[PDB]
Design goal:
The structure is a homodimer. Chain A is mostly beta strands. The first copy, chain A, has helices at 7-10, 95-99, 112-121, 158-163, and strands spanning 13-19, 24-31, 34-39, 48-53, 55-60, 63-69, 75-81, 86-93, 128-141. Bound molecules: barium ion (BA), chloride ion and sodium ion (4 copies). One sodium ion (NA) binds at residues 28, 36, 50, 146-147, 149-151 of chain A.
Chain lengths: 175, 175
Amino acid sequence: TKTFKTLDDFLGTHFIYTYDNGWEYEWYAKNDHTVDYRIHGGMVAGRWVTDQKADIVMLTEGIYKISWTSPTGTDVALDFMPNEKKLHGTIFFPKWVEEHPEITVTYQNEHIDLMEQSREKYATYPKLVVPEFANITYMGDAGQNNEDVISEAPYKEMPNDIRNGKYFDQNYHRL
Amino acid sequence: TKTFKTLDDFLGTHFIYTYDNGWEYEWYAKNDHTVDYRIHGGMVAGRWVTDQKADIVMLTEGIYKISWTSPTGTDVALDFMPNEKKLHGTIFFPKWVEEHPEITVTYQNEHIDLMEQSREKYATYPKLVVPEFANITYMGDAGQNNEDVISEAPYKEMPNDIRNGKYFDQNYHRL
Ligand SMILES: [Ba+2]
Ligand SMILES: [Cl-]
Ligand code: NA
Ligand code: NA
Ligand code: NA
Ligand code: NA
């Protein structure tokens, strides 16, 4: 077990977690203004995102808050409490994402224009707000600016492969 | 200052705080699902809200997170660290609020239809995201469900009057 104490301790960390609503997420603090993530279970499962710009601060010792807005229109605020293996996230979904979640299920980086066209075309209100705690199931020190971390679409067995030490090498690159 | 340990300690607390951009806000935890607030500084100074529904939780001992979405379309995630006199809030404004702030500068509770109509008529994107720490300059033990706390429009010297103990009586009523 390592104690998370500084912003530097947190950056470069690679998380897997399950929300209290059953939803399984994966998230990486690439650097101090960039996040990658990959969704395994729930409404928008299969979706993954690299190079998302984000405000990342340490609130107080060992507690980390991350904010970003998405090309879909989705707003996010994550609070990591890694010394307790816990997280809290609020996701503010536009109405169209709840109605048509599969539109967002893709490699978003290749379909930015689709997301921007969708968010203006389809309904935004009422919003779906998902305020939930999560248990952290995996913590890896990937280092900052590591391109191998979230570099492919999710598959059924992927979270287990990572948790079991059968996905990355000693240097945290994929085999 | 009292030590905040539990969710109970937090509920019924009346705050005034200045964000790092200089924006003075005031905010009250009326109950476990309801917030009242009043704005004294910045883009939407003069705006006040009551009976806004919100998700309110204790993240970890003495740290609190509040999530709500507004009739304006605005998304808010607030993190309180009252034992440090520090807070962090992320506000996600629709483009239209940045472009027409003065529509929202009113008692919202009397102009709900105008807010809902404007969020549909004007632009949602790009969002203006305001990630900032605040310094807490006032903490009042207002008790839960006190309708007097935020019951009038802000005036210039109002935060001073509250800080200076000239606004409420001994039972935390305006008079
Ligand atoms: Ba698709
Ligand atoms: Cl509101
Ligand atoms: Na995104
Ligand atoms: Na990556
Ligand atoms: Na203040
Ligand atoms: Na303001």
